[PDB]
């Protein structure tokens with residue numbers, strides 16, 4: 001997260017860290033046994049780490065659970081990143097409490113101008129790499145579809161939306177992929193891609209979760 005602030009320990013209780021010997025992507029807990037992340041974060045050997053603040057220190061509240069299976073959307077296109085969503089089923093259910101809690105799926109899509117919270121342990125520098133130990137937060141608005149298509153002509157599909165600042169300086173970045181974009185208490189986006197990080201007129205692009213709620217529900221119901 002570039003231009004963000006320290007969230008504060010366990011203030012984003014649905015945030016998870018996907019780990020394979022190091023943090024490589026974020027994710028969101030949607031119920032005690034499932035996590036939603038980005039399809040491009042897929043790899044085998046994933047351990048889901050819940051209740052984290054400093055990912056390099058066991059401070060208490062952490063729950064490390066192995067993934068039993070990861071389900072990448074069947075129509076995920078790795079060249080366009082269209083349908084960049086994946087569901088991860090945990091080997092055992094997590095113990096939910098005030099520090100580890102799930103976030104709700106939306107019933108309607110969010111409008112331009114909606115203010116959202118983006119969080120993650122990704123790079124905090126736009127020019128270079130500085131990875132934080134604790135969770136960073138960023139408040140950012142959803143941009144109109146015309147400004148998003150004007151910024152990335154021919155690369156935005158109806159399953160994506162832009163959020164951020166066209167002046168540059170505040171954005172999600174590498175290491176934040178798969179993490180949450182929460183607006184009014186509902187999970188509206190998944191950190192997916194962008195051109196560099198916090199560059200002027202190049203806002204971040206997010207997977208539009210409201211287009212996948214029936215898919216998520218039907219997939220969880222059958223697995």
Ligand SMILES: NC(=[NH2+])c1ccc2[nH]c(-c3cc(F)ccc3[O-])nc2c1
Nearest residue numbers: 172173174177192193194196197204
């Ligand atoms: N500017 C952004 N809003 C952004 C967000 C997530 C990213 N994730 C990545 C990324 C880069 C890699 F080289 C490998 C995996 C990633 O998720 N770049 C990203 C850029």
Ligand SMILES: [Ca+2]
Nearest residue numbers: 054057058059
């Ligand atoms: Ca920790």
